[PDB]
Write a protein that binds this ligand. Sequence first.
Ligand SMILES: O=C1Cc2ccccc2/C1=C\c1ccc2c(c1C(=O)O)OCO2
Ligand SMILES: O=C1Cc2ccccc2/C1=C\c1ccc2c(c1C(=O)O)OCO2
Ligand SMILES: O=C1Cc2ccccc2/C1=C\c1ccc2c(c1C(=O)O)OCO2
Ligand SMILES: O=C1Cc2ccccc2/C1=C\c1ccc2c(c1C(=O)O)OCO2
Lengths: 149, 149
Amino acid sequence: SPGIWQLDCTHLEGKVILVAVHVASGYIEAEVIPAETGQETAYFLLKLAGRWPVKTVHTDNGSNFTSTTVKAACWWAGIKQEDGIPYNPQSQGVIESMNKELKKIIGQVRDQAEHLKTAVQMAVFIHNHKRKGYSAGERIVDIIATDIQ
Amino acid sequence: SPGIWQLDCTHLEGKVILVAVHVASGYIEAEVIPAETGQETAYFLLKLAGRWPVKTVHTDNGSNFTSTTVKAACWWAGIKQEDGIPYNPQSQGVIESMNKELKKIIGQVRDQAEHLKTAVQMAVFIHNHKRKGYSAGERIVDIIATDIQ
Ligand SMILES: O=C1Cc2ccccc2/C1=C\c1ccc2c(c1C(=O)O)OCO2
Ligand SMILES: O=C1Cc2ccccc2/C1=C\c1ccc2c(c1C(=O)O)OCO2
Ligand SMILES: O=C1Cc2ccccc2/C1=C\c1ccc2c(c1C(=O)O)OCO2
Ligand SMILES: O=C1Cc2ccccc2/C1=C\c1ccc2c(c1C(=O)O)OCO2
């Protein structure tokens, strides 16, 4: 489980927000794209895996699970690509809650930037620094450092 | 020490690659932009500081040191913005070497993707995972984990 991430795609302002959550910590990275394609999802996973030791990804839907470009990036980066089926139903709920909480934060900051993408990165920052006690950013570093050592 | 990063801007294919290096580990994040502006540097620093606990940044040149947009982002994210002057000249030489090494990796992958931005993220991945013995990605997590405790 230190290597497990989940993809999640949510919509705001006619645009798509692609999120990766590190399931054990709650830590996230996110970006805005005009629409979810395999091309964009593949690039996002390549960025993530160069930054954190991503071993497994639960993909967000069957189009990205099937996408040959996503499978190419998962092969390149050494990621085991998995489906995203909430074989555990508390999964659907945790992700829904995250999207509602991210959108709330986005609305709390939205007036401080012109572009949605800036607001989304402000919300990533506030989410990862929030203590709840340790923050998600502290949790992920502690988890992965324990895994190394 | 655990919160110190250095900005570095290098050029390839008529484009600019903006790099942040975590000085104690060598770990990097990077992006391709059409040219270095305060706007893009500000956005890049907001992304970085949402993902790692960025306390101090040595800016790469005086235009980004002066930029009011850069200063806004550093204020928003809680980053101490510093000049980039190698009061220790070892610094310049280290950054030069990194740019040469990154360009070398980029050339090694360049034919595997159409777009430079993809090649640069492949190079970020190879650089962060290279063991030296620990990799930069391992060093950064160990340093920050040690700091949290
Ligand atoms: O062919 C491959 C192998 C590979 C391995 C890992 C990641 C990407 C690619 C990849 C292509 C590609 C994919 C998405 C992109 C993208 C490109 C590109 O060709 O630059 O550009 C932006 O989003
Ligand atoms: O260790 C990590 C990795 C990480 C990734 C993303 C965000 C924060 C962190 C982080 C630590 C942290 C450090 C100093 C702070 C701070 C926090 C925090 O609250 O997250 O809050 C104020 O000064
Ligand atoms: O005014 C502020 C306060 C602030 C605080 C933190 C980061 C950005 C901003 C910021 C503006 C901004 C800056 C760069 C951008 C950007 C925008 C934007 O307005 O969306 O869009 C992409 O690069
Ligand atoms: O702990 C971290 C944080 C980090 C950030 C970026 C890249 C790697 C790492 C990393 C660990 C790591 C884990 C498993 C590996 C591996 C490495 C590595 O070599 O970096 O190499 C192959 O299997």
